[PDB]
Write an enzyme that holds these catalytic residues in place. Structure first.
Site, mmCIF file in Angstrom:
data_model
loop_
_atom_site.group_PDB
_atom_site.id
_atom_site.type_symbol
_atom_site.label_atom_id
_atom_site.label_comp_id
_atom_site.label_asym_id
_atom_site.label_seq_id
_atom_site.Cartn_x
_atom_site.Cartn_y
_atom_site.Cartn_z
ATOM 1 N N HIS A 31 0.792 -1.224 0.000
ATOM 2 C CA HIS A 31 0.000 0.000 0.000
ATOM 3 C C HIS A 31 0.836 1.291 0.000
ATOM 4 C CE1 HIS A 31 0.453 -0.169 4.507
ATOM 5 N NE2 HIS A 31 0.472 1.143 4.343
ATOM 6 N N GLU A 52 0.053 -7.719 0.986
ATOM 7 C CA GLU A 52 0.693 -6.440 1.312
ATOM 8 C C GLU A 52 2.217 -6.512 1.247
ATOM 9 O OE1 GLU A 52 -1.898 -3.905 0.811
ATOM 10 O OE2 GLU A 52 -0.280 -3.075 2.076
ATOM 11 N N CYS A 129 5.952 2.805 6.758
ATOM 12 C CA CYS A 129 5.632 1.535 6.130
ATOM 13 C C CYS A 129 6.615 1.225 5.011
ATOM 14 C CB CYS A 129 4.195 1.536 5.615
ATOM 15 S SG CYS A 129 3.000 1.029 6.896
HETATM 16 C C1 LIG Z 1 2.197 2.622 7.173
HETATM 17 O O1 LIG Z 1 1.490 2.921 5.998
HETATM 18 C C2 LIG Z 1 1.204 2.522 8.318
HETATM 19 C C3 LIG Z 1 1.957 2.273 9.636
HETATM 20 C C4 LIG Z 1 1.492 3.177 10.781
HETATM 21 C C5 LIG Z 1 2.108 2.802 12.161
HETATM 22 O O2 LIG Z 1 2.877 1.906 12.266
HETATM 23 N N1 LIG Z 1 1.742 3.535 13.368
HETATM 24 C C6 LIG Z 1 0.803 4.648 13.275
HETATM 25 C C7 LIG Z 1 -0.024 4.811 14.570
HETATM 26 C C8 LIG Z 1 -1.376 5.362 14.203
HETATM 27 N N2 LIG Z 1 -2.245 4.260 13.809
HETATM 28 C C9 LIG Z 1 -2.868 4.033 12.627
HETATM 29 C C10 LIG Z 1 -3.656 2.808 12.657
HETATM 30 N N3 LIG Z 1 -3.420 2.395 13.896
HETATM 31 N N4 LIG Z 1 -2.604 3.235 14.556
HETATM 32 C C11 LIG Z 1 -4.528 2.139 11.563
HETATM 33 C C12 LIG Z 1 -4.247 0.652 11.353
HETATM 34 N N5 LIG Z 1 -4.094 -0.055 12.628
HETATM 35 C C13 LIG Z 1 -5.127 -1.065 13.013
HETATM 36 O O3 LIG Z 1 -6.086 -1.199 12.318
HETATM 37 O O4 LIG Z 1 -4.999 -1.878 14.187
HETATM 38 C C14 LIG Z 1 -3.901 -2.777 14.171
HETATM 39 C C15 LIG Z 1 -4.451 -4.215 14.012
HETATM 40 C C16 LIG Z 1 -3.583 -5.296 14.063
HETATM 41 C C17 LIG Z 1 -4.071 -6.590 13.904
HETATM 42 C C18 LIG Z 1 -5.436 -6.807 13.691
HETATM 43 C C19 LIG Z 1 -6.306 -5.728 13.640
HETATM 44 C C20 LIG Z 1 -5.810 -4.429 13.796
HETATM 45 C C21 LIG Z 1 -3.001 0.502 10.469
HETATM 46 O O5 LIG Z 1 -1.907 0.363 10.923
HETATM 47 N N6 LIG Z 1 -3.212 0.539 9.010
HETATM 48 C C22 LIG Z 1 -2.085 0.405 8.096
HETATM 49 C C23 LIG Z 1 -2.568 0.358 6.658
HETATM 50 C C24 LIG Z 1 -3.394 -0.934 6.366
HETATM 51 C C25 LIG Z 1 -2.614 -2.225 6.574
HETATM 52 C C26 LIG Z 1 -3.953 -0.881 4.954
HETATM 53 C C27 LIG Z 1 -1.162 1.603 8.323
HETATM 54 O O6 LIG Z 1 -1.598 2.650 8.695
HETATM 55 N N7 LIG Z 1 0.274 1.406 8.095
#
Ligand SMILES: *[C@@H](O)[C@@H]1CCC(=O)NCCCn2cc(nn2)C[C@H](NC(=O)OCc2ccccc2)C(=O)N[C@@H](CC(C)C)C(=O)N1
Length: 162
Positions: A31, A52, A129
């Site tokens: 992503h 991913e 990321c």
């Molecule tokens: C890189 O693109 C980012 C990494 C962001 C990071 O490491 N820390 C940021 C802290 C703020 N934050 C955003 C989220 N959570 N915290 C959104 C989402 N996290 C989440 O949904 O919970 C974690 C989880 C783990 C296991 C099972 C269920 C839930 C998240 O990290 N989203 C990603 C993008 C997705 C994978 C498309 C992201 O923001 N990556």
């Protein structure tokens, strides 16, 4: 301790980062890829993407200076890796992580073939990321690219290859 040549594999890419595994192999989180790569038309590259985790195989040698390293499908559980985070400011931020288990995950609606871990004061931000998860085995092994963390920061996920 990660040496400069290792750090130099971490490369600004799209909305995040990527890692030069070898002179020809670049890996990143799906992503962050934008929608040419390092001055190569798209037809030049062997693109493999799933869960991913994106891998690019290039035709020409893009980083002749590196020795190829071992890309494993995750790492044994419990293991401690370092996350090699570069910030847009140039700061290097090596985060140590105790790696939990590999699992299919659905994170904000995307399927992640990932491995969780606990940190060991500091945490990941959006923009981190694609940063690699690594450990040394006389080798350095890369087992993942950064993909997610919890709203908090305690738990992080890296996408792994299959
Ligand atoms: C890189 O693109 C980012 C990494 C962001 C990071 O490491 N820390 C940021 C802290 C703020 N934050 C955003 C989220 N959570 N915290 C959104 C989402 N996290 C989440 O949904 O919970 C974690 C989880 C783990 C296991 C099972 C269920 C839930 C998240 O990290 N989203 C990603 C993008 C997705 C994978 C498309 C992201 O923001 N990556």
């Amino acid at each position: 301790h990660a040496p400069p040549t290792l750090w130099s594999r971490v490369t600004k890419f799209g909305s995040g980062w990527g890692f030069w595994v070898s002179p020809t192999v670049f890996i990143t989180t799906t992503h962050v890829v934008p929608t040419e790569f390092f001055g190569e038309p798209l037809s030049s590259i062997a693109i493999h993407q799933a869960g991913e985790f994106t891998q690019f195989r290039f035709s020409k040698k893009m980083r002749p200076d590196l020795t190829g390293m071992v890309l494993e499908e995750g790492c044994p559980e419990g293991t401690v890796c370092s996350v090699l985070i570069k910030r847009d400011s140039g700061e290097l931020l090596p985060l140590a992580v105790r790696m939990g288990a590999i699992a299919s995950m659905r994170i904000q609606g995307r399927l992640v073939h990932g491995q969780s871990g606990m940190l060991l004061d500091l945490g990941t931000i959006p923009g981190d990321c694609g940063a690699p998860y690594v450990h040394k085995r006389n080798d350095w092994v890369v087992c993942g690219v950064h993909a997610a963390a919890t709203k908090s920061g305690n738990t992080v996920v890296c996408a792994v290859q299959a």
